Amino acid sequence: KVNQDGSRVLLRDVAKIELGGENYDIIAEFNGQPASGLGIKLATGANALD
Amino acid sequence: DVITAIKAQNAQVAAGQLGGTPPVKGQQLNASIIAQTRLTSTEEFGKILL
């Protein structure tokens, strides 16, 4: 907005502009410690071993 | 005027959970909000503020 006294209301003054994630639904830790990872799955037919 | 009402009046909206996405310390109830959902009858349809 641009209030009557002509100041400025910008996001900073209403929204805490951070930088988090898409979801806060998956929380993972390795050995009780904070971590991420990827559940790499085997495509049909291909060799697990390869 | 009729069309553009059977739209608004009969639709399916969104509304997050209660916790889920990042909550506050020590919260306890997470539930799911259920806002506007489609009419299901000639009754409910008969009544539309035009």
UniProtKB/Swiss-Prot annotation, chain A:
It comes from the Bacteria. It is found in: Cell inner membrane. Induction: Positively regulated by MarA, Rob and SoxS transcriptional regulators (at protein level). Disruption phenotype: Loss of susceptibility to contact-dependent growth inhibition (CDI); inhibiting cells still contact the target. Belongs to the resistance-nodulation-cell division (RND) (TC 2.A.6) family. AcrA-AcrB-AcrZ-TolC is a drug efflux protein complex with broad substrate specificity that uses the proton motive force to export substrates. This is Multidrug efflux pump subunit AcrB. It comes from Escherichia coli (strain K12). The lineage of its organism: Bacteria, Pseudomonadati, Pseudomonadota, Gammaproteobacteria, Enterobacterales. The gene is acrB. The chain holds residues 252 to 301 of 1049 of the full protein.
Swiss-Prot record, chain B:
Disruption phenotype: Loss of susceptibility to contact-dependent growth inhibition (CDI); inhibiting cells still contact the target. Induction: Positively regulated by MarA, Rob and SoxS transcriptional regulators (at protein level). It is found in: Cell inner membrane. Belongs to the resistance-nodulation-cell division (RND) (TC 2.A.6) family. AcrA-AcrB-AcrZ-TolC is a drug efflux protein complex with broad substrate specificity that uses the proton motive force to export substrates. Homotrimer, with large domains that extend into the periplasm, interacts with AcrA and TolC. AcrA may be required to stably link this protein and TolC. Interacts with AcrZ. Part of the AcrA-AcrB-AcrZ-TolC efflux pump. This is Multidrug efflux pump subunit AcrB. It comes from Escherichia coli (strain K12). The lineage of its organism: Bacteria, Pseudomonadati, Pseudomonadota, Gammaproteobacteria, Enterobacterales. The chain holds residues 202 to 251 of 1049 of the full protein.
